[PDB]
Amino acid sequence: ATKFPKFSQELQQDPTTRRIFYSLATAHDFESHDGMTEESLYQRIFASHFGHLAIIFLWTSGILFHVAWQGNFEAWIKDPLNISPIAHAIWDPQFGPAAMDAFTPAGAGNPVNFCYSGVYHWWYTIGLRTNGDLFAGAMFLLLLAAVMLYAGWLHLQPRYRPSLAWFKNAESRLNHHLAGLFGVSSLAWTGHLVHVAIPESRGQHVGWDNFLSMPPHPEGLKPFFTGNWGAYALNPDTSEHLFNTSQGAGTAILTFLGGFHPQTESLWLTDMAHHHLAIAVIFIIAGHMYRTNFGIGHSIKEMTESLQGPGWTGFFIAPNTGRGHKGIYDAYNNSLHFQLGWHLACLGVVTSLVAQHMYAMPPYAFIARDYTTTAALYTHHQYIAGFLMLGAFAHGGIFLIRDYDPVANENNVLARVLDHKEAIISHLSWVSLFLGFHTLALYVHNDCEVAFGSPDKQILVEPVFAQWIQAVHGKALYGISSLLSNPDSIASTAWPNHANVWLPGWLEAINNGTNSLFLAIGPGDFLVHHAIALGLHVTTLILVKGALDARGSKLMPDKKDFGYAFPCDGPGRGGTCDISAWDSVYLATFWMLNTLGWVTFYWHWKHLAIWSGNVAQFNEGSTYLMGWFRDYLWLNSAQLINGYNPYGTNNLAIWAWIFLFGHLVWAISFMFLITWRGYWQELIETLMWAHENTPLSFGYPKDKPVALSIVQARLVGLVHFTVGYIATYGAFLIASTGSRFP
Amino acid sequence: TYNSHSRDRLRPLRKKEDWYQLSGGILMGSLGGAIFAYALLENFELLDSILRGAVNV
Amino acid sequence: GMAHGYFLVGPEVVFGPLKEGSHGANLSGLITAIYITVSACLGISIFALATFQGDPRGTYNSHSRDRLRPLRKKEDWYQLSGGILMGSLGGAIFAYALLENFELLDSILRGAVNV
Amino acid sequence: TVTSLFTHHMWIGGFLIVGAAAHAGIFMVRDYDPAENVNNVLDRVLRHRDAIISHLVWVCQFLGFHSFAMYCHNDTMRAFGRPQDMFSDTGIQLQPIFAQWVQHIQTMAVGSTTAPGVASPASYAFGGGLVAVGGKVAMMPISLGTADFLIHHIHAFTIHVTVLVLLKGVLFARNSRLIPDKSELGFRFPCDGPGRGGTCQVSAWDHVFLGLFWMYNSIAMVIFHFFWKMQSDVWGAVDANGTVSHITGGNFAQSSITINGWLRDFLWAQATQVISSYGSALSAYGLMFLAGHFVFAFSLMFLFSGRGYWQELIESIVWAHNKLRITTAIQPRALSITQGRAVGAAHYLLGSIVTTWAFFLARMAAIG
Amino acid sequence: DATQLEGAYAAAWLPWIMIPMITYILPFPIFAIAFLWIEREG
Amino acid sequence: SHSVKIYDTCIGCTQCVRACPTDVLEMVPWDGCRAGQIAASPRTEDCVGCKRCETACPTDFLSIRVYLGAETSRSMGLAY
Numbered sequence A: 001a002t003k004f005p006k007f008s009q010e011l012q013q014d015p016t017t018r019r020i021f022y023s024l025a026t027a028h029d030f031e032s033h034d035g036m037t038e039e040s041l042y043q044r045i046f047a048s049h050f051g052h053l054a055i056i057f058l059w060t061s062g063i064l065f066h067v068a069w070q071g072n073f074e075a076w077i078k079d080p081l082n083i084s085p086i087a088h089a090i091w092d093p094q095f096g097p098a099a100m101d102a103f104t105p106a107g108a109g110n111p112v113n114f115c116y117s118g119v120y121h122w123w124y125t126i127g128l129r130t131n132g133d134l135f136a137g138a139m140f141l142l143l144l145a146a147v148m149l150y151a152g153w154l155h156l157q158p159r160y161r162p163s164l165a166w167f168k169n170a171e172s173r174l175n176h177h178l179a180g181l182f183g184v185s186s187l188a189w190t191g192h193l194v195h196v197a198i199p200e201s202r203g204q205h206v207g208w209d210n211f212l213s214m215p216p217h218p219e220g221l222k223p224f225f226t227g228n229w230g231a232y233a234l235n236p237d238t239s240e241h242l243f244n245t246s247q248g249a250g251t252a253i254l255t256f257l258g259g260f261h262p263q264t265e266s267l268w269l270t271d272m273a274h275h276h277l278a279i280a281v282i283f284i285i286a287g288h289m290y291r292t293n294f295g296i297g298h299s300i301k302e303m304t305e306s307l308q309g310p311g312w313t314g315f316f317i318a319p320n321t322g323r324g325h326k327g328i329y330d331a332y333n334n335s336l337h338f339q340l341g342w343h344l345a346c347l348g349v350v351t352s353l354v355a356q357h358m359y360a361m362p363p364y365a366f367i368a369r370d371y372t373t374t375a376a377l378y379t380h381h382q383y384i385a386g387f388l389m390l391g392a393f394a395h396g397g398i399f400l401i402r403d404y405d406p407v408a409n410e411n412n413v414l415a416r417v418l419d420h421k422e423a424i425i426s427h428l429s430w431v432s433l434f435l436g437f438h439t440l441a442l443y444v445h446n447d448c449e450v451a452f453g454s455p456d457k458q459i460l461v462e463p464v465f466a467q468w469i470q471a472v473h474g475k476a477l478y479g480i481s482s483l484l485s486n487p488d489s490i491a492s493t494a495w496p497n498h499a500n501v502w503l504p505g506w507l508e509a510i511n512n513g514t515n516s517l518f519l520a521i522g523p524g525d526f527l528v529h530h531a532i533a534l535g536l537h538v539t540t541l542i543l544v545k546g547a548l549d550a551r552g553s554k555l556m557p558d559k560k561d562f563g564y565a566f567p568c569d570g571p572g573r574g575g576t577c578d579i580s581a582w583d584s585v586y587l588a589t590f591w592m593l594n595t596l597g598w599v600t601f602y603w604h605w606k607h608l609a610i611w612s613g614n615v616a617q618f619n620e621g622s623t624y625l626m627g628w629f630r631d632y633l634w635l636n637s638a639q640l641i642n643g644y645n646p647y648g649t650n651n652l653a654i655w656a657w658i659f660l661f662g663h664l665v666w667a668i669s670f671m672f673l674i675t676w677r678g679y680w681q682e683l684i685e686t687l688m689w690a691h692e693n694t695p696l697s698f699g700y701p702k703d704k705p706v707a708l709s710i711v712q713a714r715l716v717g718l719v720h721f722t723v724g725y726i727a728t729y730g731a732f733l734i735a736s737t738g739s740r741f742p
Numbered sequence B: 001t002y003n004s005h006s007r008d009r010l011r012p013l014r015k016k017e018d019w020y021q022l023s024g025g026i027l028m029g030s031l032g033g034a035i036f037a038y039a040l041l042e043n044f045e046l047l048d049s050i051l052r053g054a055v056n057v
Numbered sequence C: 001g002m003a004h005g006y007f008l009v010g011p012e013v014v015f016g017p018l019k020e021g022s023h024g025a026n027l028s029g030l031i032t033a034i035y036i037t038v039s040a041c042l043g044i045s046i047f048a049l050a051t052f053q054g055d056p057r058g059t060y061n062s063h064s065r066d067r068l069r070p071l072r073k074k075e076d077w078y079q080l081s082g083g084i085l086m087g088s089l090g091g092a093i094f095a096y097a098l099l100e101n102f103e104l105l106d107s108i109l110r111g112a113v114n115v
Numbered sequence D: 001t002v003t004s005l006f007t008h009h010m011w012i013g014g015f016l017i018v019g020a021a022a023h024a025g026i027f028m029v030r031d032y033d034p035a036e037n038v039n040n041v042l043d044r045v046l047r048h049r050d051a052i053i054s055h056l057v058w059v060c061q062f063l064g065f066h067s068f069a070m071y072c073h074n075d076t077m078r079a080f081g082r083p084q085d086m087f088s089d090t091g092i093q094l095q096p097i098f099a100q101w102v103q104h105i106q107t108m109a110v111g112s113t114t115a116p117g118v119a120s121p122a123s124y125a126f127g128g129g130l131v132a133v134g135g136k137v138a139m140m141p142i143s144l145g146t147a148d149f150l151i152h153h154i155h156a157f158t159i160h161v162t163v164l165v166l167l168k169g170v171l172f173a174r175n176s177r178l179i180p181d182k183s184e185l186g187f188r189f190p191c192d193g194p195g196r197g198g199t200c201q202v203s204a205w206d207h208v209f210l211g212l213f214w215m216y217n218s219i220a221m222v223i224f225h226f227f228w229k230m231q232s233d234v235w236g237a238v239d240a241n242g243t244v245s246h247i248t249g250g251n252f253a254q255s256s257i258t259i260n261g262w263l264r265d266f267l268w269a270q271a272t273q274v275i276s277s278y279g280s281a282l283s284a285y286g287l288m289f290l291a292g293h294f295v296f297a298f299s300l301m302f303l304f305s306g307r308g309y310w311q312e313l314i315e316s317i318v319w320a321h322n323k324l325r326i327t328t329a330i331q332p333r334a335l336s337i338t339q340g341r342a343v344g345a346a347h348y349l350l351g352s353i354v355t356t357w358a359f360f361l362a363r364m365a366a367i368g
Numbered sequence E: 001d002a003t004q005l006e007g008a009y010a011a012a013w014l015p016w017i018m019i020p021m022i023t024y025i026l027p028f029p030i031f032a033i034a035f036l037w038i039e040r041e042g
Numbered sequence F: 001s002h003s004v005k006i007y008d009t010c011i012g013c014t015q016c017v018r019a020c021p022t023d024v025l026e027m028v029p030w031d032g033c034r035a036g037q038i039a040a041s042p043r044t045e046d047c048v049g050c051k052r053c054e055t056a057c058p059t060d061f062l063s064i065r066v067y068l069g070a071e072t073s074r075s076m077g078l079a080y
């Protein structure tokens, strides 16, 4: 018996090398820990959250510190179109001088990394102008991380650990998060936007030495108190306004122009300040709905338990749902896995929204012209979102294993979807099969037509519904005079009101065929959207099937007694490999990775063809699969794989090396994924024979060498597949874009 | 503290053999660590060119 | 240690990044032998620290019949670690000193010092 | 034709050699009798197989570091910009002096010596002269440098790990330290449950399964070595004077020593003729190139997934069928564990070999 | 031009010592401390 | 050690006991089925977890379940 891990007596008795690996992958599962009460669980999670926020603040502080010490922020604000932002400096002692020269730009005296995270554009759009500003922000975030660390340590002290009834307070928390984490924080961000960001955008310097001096508006808090609020939307920035300079400047602080600043090709800062103000007011209002200890307010529990039956006082949009939502509040509030899998689904939808919105409506100055930054940011957030959506269903399964109560949830919506789960799974299966057969067969027909010298015989189906939705927003690209495309329509004019003051600015941007806001779509878009539909449907099939069959199926009726992750149930009953619910999240990680590959491949090729000017490359080349293979993967690889050749090294040498590194890790995954445990256990037995019988080999394993377990090697191979899949595509996307468009 | 009845937890070398083995070890280790620091300071020009990658030309 | 630190100097002297020049090559080989010695002896020390806790498990248990592993006590392992460290650092600097003075050792073994 | 014949006979040989181990394991489980053969060579091999297998494990590791990790060394040194530190013919040279000496003995033997009867060398690959027919090179000396040392040690490594995988299943087909009664379980059985840590793929059949992949990985590198070396250092176009312009231009000696040069100067560069073949007469090769990629990727569905997922999804599909009263008497069951393994292996091999076939044949039918 | 590693930034001697400490001097002590922590007996 | 549980749907066919490679299981008198026998698992410290006993069980669902638990040197099947 070792003393490690201290959270599990059964792993301390483990005499093998399995306990080291199982103590690393069961360390944060506090529920299944020795002597864990619910209160102690919540308190530990609270302190862990504080340490996590400290890590986030330390990370942001380090980014700020390395741009302020080793970047070129002050040199880049002078020309943010012809200067590459610098992340930090290289100190690899193993470089030859040919790599030291390759990673040194024209305006630098040391090897550096080019920044592709977009923080230069973000910091330039919010007022930060000097390295001293960046250093001050970094030191503030260092101290704020220290504050979060002290808070986390403090709430582990006996007089300061919150009670369980405090953690169960779902009415006070929603009020304080809606009004005070989303409202007051957004109100403070509007305050910064009108005090620092918009002034510094016009050329005036506002700091913590003259902000009490400088008023944000010529009539300081005169229009707001008097009630004439339209004065703040008067004299905006003119079209010929040059960012960070006063030429073309205005005086307005809250205006609603719509569209983009024509010089930075980004959203207007007056629009973003007005946005965050109208968001702050609505969220501060919304954080006044539930009662805490002042009598007024709602009770969430009484609202949910009131959706039981029929009638207008009952759940009338689905009266045949039995007990309706009775027990759903307690399923949410008592189960931390229900909350986590619910919040992960919400966050994974919001992260995809972030990715889908920040390329179409760029919010930062000159970030639409940083092509590699735009591509990296979209791909980053879409992969983060796919992982969050995968973990949403993971913890939906873990809730149904660990916290689901079939009697507290008797005949409600949750127990009503668990009843007919075969209908849900078979209909996801039907949608998946239909989409897959049709999309693959259309692509293969197009391949066989183009290969046999008939590109004209391809089946090219236009996305007429999405082209029409492009038209209902005011796109005149097609011959569809729909709602906002029709200039004297009920939607365009706002007949009684005539207050859509967003319409001319928004139609200046959607009709502008040079931004990414509602890109033109054709036949090659319809097929890849159906492929994305297939991918999301099959990933949902795997995850929904494994969550709904988590508690048991016909092949293993008592699957809830074996846990969430377990290898199998042996080779009986035909064999039960990958039968656990954890293995569904395992099997759907491949499909998430494949779907996000399709998504990001589509986005990247669409934009590479747009940015090069040769949009017909993607147009008449994405309808068949060899065009994807040859005009995207083969073609935009020539600069990456020539990062180092027998003639020299350019600055793409690390991207070529990481491309090969990701290929290596992805291949190593297949070793854990195809070869299984007994092969390696017999190999390790021969190795144990060899070691005990060799002279001069005085070491001996304290813990017995065993092969990695079944679930362990599934996780190890999946982690390898993921890491190599991310590394290969991250190296290709940064180098295929940063070389064509330096 | 080196009497047999002593309860000092902070002085655990109770035998003279421990003290002679300690003296020999401190002598060997200290003379070696001194000449290791001396050798790193004598070759500081080389250790500097190494840690700057100046040897990869 | 003497035998080991002696030969561990050579691979970096011939093959290392400093191999284009004699003085730097011998220094890179010396510090490679020094680093490998200190790492190996740190491993010997932590093997003895982790293994000999109560009655050890495996070949250093009191009931073990392994003839090929005769250092049964932790005192043997600590004395071994100290000896391997001393001998290996000395053998490494002896090989380094013979390679630094290779011009002199060469003129000696050719009788060029008898003029 | 030369490419196709060499490649075809290497694949047939590798498959046949894997079947040899397959039937050496079937002999063990079924036809081996301990009472028949007592203290003979067959009994004495089974009676020290831990020594055989552990020494094969060590030699596979030694060969894997001293072939492939040297390629990784070369990649890192070439990306650093220090090619004097590489294992090249211009960096740290690794000349195969024994094979070079055999080549010299072969060209000295045939003099007007040790073989006075022969006029020419037994092949011009050893030495001698250049035979060019119709302008194109029939045969010329195959120079062996550092790249050839490195790729022959790749070959030794891959053959040895194939032997490890196959011999391990043959030697432990009867029993092991884990499962002492493995011969009672059969030659083709999936596992012996999740106990003893999990005894997945302990049968001899599963070792034939895992050695099929290793024979693929071994023979693919042999046919790649042949294709690139013959295409850059033998095959070409002799002019009137006699100057030989090789097909890829003698780039094996400097590009085939890194993994990046294998991916760029062999795979990316020489697949120009198979992906740019649409609309031509070689378009079937481009179609089969993509088809092989499909079948390779489709194999991974059977190789990475397990049987219980599919049996539990068939439950929902059977429910949807029972509701329409389209129930069938033959009850639909997922593929068994070893059958899912066999299907995955067959698909991987088929797609991955059809890909190389299309790549070789489109390349050689376009640039001659 | 660049014959060796340089720093055109403040306290450019700090990478020179920080990269050895973080990457090949302090890690094997940390590995030894973690190994002694996971192998200590009750 | 693993946990081997025997439920009252047992019919005393002995097939789980005959299939056990490590002798965990035996038959005890029951008078709860007409065979008069039910399986028992006293030497469950010997259980490796192969689930041969579960493969040998004819009842639907199984009258014997193995729950893989804390791994010891016996349940990992280690001769080293």
Ligand code: F6C
Binding pocket: A687, A690, A691, A694, A696, A697, A698, A699, A700, C039, C040, C041, C042, C043, C044, D054, D055, D057, D058, D061, E028, E029, E031, E032
């Ligand atoms: C110490 C202890 C010990 C000892 C003594 O003492 C030993 C020894 C042996 C002998 C006898 C042999 C031969 C040698 C050679 O050649 O090869 C090398 C390798 C190595 C690894 C080498 C080793 C060496 C040592 C480790 C040294 C040390 C170093 C330092 C100390 C570190 C530092 C520390 C810090 C803290 C970090 C062996 C081997 C084998 N291994 Mg074996 N080891 C061991 C450990 C380990 C671990 C952990 C693992 C896991 C990874 C394994 C694994 C393995 C495998 C797979 C195999 C094979 O293959 C082989 C064989 O079988 O044959 C046949 N194994 N090995």
Ligand code: CLA
Binding pocket: A063, A115, A116, A117, A119, A375, A376, A377, A379, A380, A383, A384, A387, A658, A722, A723, A725, A726, A727, A728, A729, A730, A731, A733, A734
């Ligand atoms: C292929 C998808 C993809 C892409 C294009 C990016 C892109 C980016 N990420 Mg990343 N990331 C991803 C997936 C992706 N991410 C996933 C799935 C995770 C969850 C683990 C992360 C977690 C993550 C963190 C913690 C951070 C980023 C950061 C960044 C930004 C700077 C790095 C860079 O310039 O380019 C290079 C992109 C690569 C993918 C290079 C390959 C390096 C391999 C993948 C290392 C393997 C580690 C692991 C698998 C993921 C690491 C990603 C990240 C460190 C680059 C950049 C916009 C940094 C940032 O936010 O800047 C301020 C940052 O700190 N990401």
Ligand code: CLA
Binding pocket: A054, A055, A058, A059, A060, A061, A062, A063, A065, A088, A089, A090, A091, A142, E014, E015, E016, E018, E019, E022
């Ligand atoms: C998490 C943010 C972060 C990241 C990813 C980096 C990364 C890097 N730093 Mg840096 N650093 C940071 C924060 C960060 N730093 C902060 C806030 C400071 C101000 C004290 C510094 C001060 C600093 C100096 C003086 C140097 C670096 C250097 C480096 C580079 C080499 C590694 C090194 O020597 O570490 C050195 C680290 C320190 C001296 C202090 C680090 C303090 C941070 C906050 C620790 C963060 C811990 C993290 C949150 C916990 C994660 C847990 C785990 C799961 C990973 C590397 C790119 C070197 C360089 O510039 O290369 C050319 C260099 O010498 N950093």
Ligand code: CLA
Binding pocket: A045, A046, A049, A050, A053, A166, A167, A169, A170, A172, A173, A176, A177, A179, A180, A181, A182, A185, A350
């Ligand atoms: C006004 C009072 C207030 C405030 C500000 C907070 C704030 C917080 N609480 Mg708390 N709480 C409160 C009252 C409050 N609470 C009360 C009264 C109770 C008792 C019922 C609780 C009980 C409680 C518990 C049990 C927990 C928290 C937690 C948290 C943290 C979670 C959110 C987060 O991590 O940061 C970030 C979130 C935001 C910044 C807003 C997110 C909005 C979206 C998702 C992002 C914004 C979108 C926008 C596009 C962003 C662009 C920025 C980009 C450009 C950089 C957070 C700092 C958790 C914690 O402990 O952390 C330590 C937690 O476990 N609270």
Ligand code: CLA
Binding pocket: A024, A025, A026, A027, A028, A029, A030, A340, A344, A387, A388, A389, A390, A391, A392, A394, A395, A398, A564, A565, A582, A585, A586, A719, A723
């Ligand atoms: C807010 C986010 C969040 C939180 C708090 C949790 C929390 C938890 N999850 Mg989880 N989950 C999430 C999101 C989250 N998850 C997402 C986004 C996914 C999909 C990927 C999952 C899928 C998932 C599964 C399938 C399981 C959990 C489990 C758990 C529990 C234990 C985790 C653990 O074992 O400790 C610590 C584990 C580790 C420290 C492992 C780290 C290794 C990871 C996998 C990869 C590391 C990257 C790699 C090193 C990069 C190197 C590259 C480069 C250097 C080359 C814990 C309560 C487990 C559970 O509840 O048991 C019933 C469980 O089985 N989660």
Ligand code: CLA
Binding pocket: A664, A667, A668, A669, A670, A671, A674, A675, A683, D056, D057, D058, D060, D061, D062, D063, D064, D065, D068, D069, D072, D161, D164, D165, D210, D213, D214
């Ligand atoms: C590229 C992917 C990849 C890699 C690297 C490996 C590697 C290995 N395989 Mg494997 N395999 C793979 C794919 C891969 N396989 C696939 C896809 C399958 C599917 C069927 C298999 C099936 C398989 C079987 C059945 C067997 C192996 C065996 C082996 C081992 C061979 C021994 C050896 O070469 O020693 C050398 C090690 C390497 C070449 C690994 C890379 C080492 C790098 C180059 C050096 C790293 C430097 C340094 C240590 C890094 C330290 C950094 C620090 C921070 C950690 C080896 C570790 C055999 C074995 O066990 O042999 C004894 C075995 O029988 N494999």
Ligand SMILES: CC1=C(/C=C/C(C)=C/C=C/C(C)=C/C=C/C=C(C)/C=C/C=C(C)/C=C/C2=C(C)CCCC2(C)C)C(C)(C)CCC1
Binding pocket: B028, B029, B031, B032, B033, B035, B036, B039, C034, C038, C086, C089, C090, C092, C093
């Ligand atoms: C308390 C503490 C601290 C401090 C620390 C310190 C105080 C430090 C240090 C340090 C030190 C002070 C270190 C050292 C070292 C050393 C070494 C590393 C050594 C060596 C050596 C050698 C290797 C030698 C060798 C030899 C011999 C022996 C013989 C012959 C000669 C020769 C040379 C070869 C802090 C606050 C920070 C934090 C943590 C805790």
Ligand SMILES: CC1=C(/C=C/C(C)=C/C=C/C(C)=C/C=C/C=C(C)/C=C/C=C(C)/C=C/C2=C(C)CCCC2(C)C)C(C)(C)CCC1
Binding pocket: C002, C003, C004, C006, C007, C086, C087, C089, C090, C091, C093, C094, C097
């Ligand atoms: C098996 C065998 C073999 C091999 C062998 C070997 C492997 C070898 C070797 C070798 C070696 C490997 C040797 C070595 C050595 C050494 C020495 C000789 C040392 C030394 C040293 C010294 C003298 C040091 C000193 C010092 C000190 C300690 C302190 C201070 C510093 C000084 C420097 C002074 C053969 C086959 C051949 C045969 C026989 C058997």
Ligand SMILES: CC1=C(C/C=C(\C)CCC[C@H](C)CCC[C@H](C)CCCC(C)C)C(=O)c2ccccc2C1=O
Binding pocket: D301, D302, D303, D305, D306, D307, D310, D311, D333, D334, D335, D336, D337, D339, D340, D341
């Ligand atoms: C997809 C998959 C399945 C499901 C595959 C099945 C069930 C086989 C698919 C073959 C189909 C069902 C063909 C049979 C249909 C009839 C023969 C009718 C065909 C129509 C013709 C007569 C025209 C597994 O069973 C399996 C098992 C173990 C590991 C991996 C996997 C795996 O990946």
Ligand SMILES: [Ca+2]
Binding pocket: B055, B056, B057, C016, C017, C018, C019, C020
């Ligand atoms: Ca050098």
Ligand SMILES: [Cl-]
Binding pocket: A644, A645, A646, D078, D255, D258, D260, D261
């Ligand atoms: Cl190269």
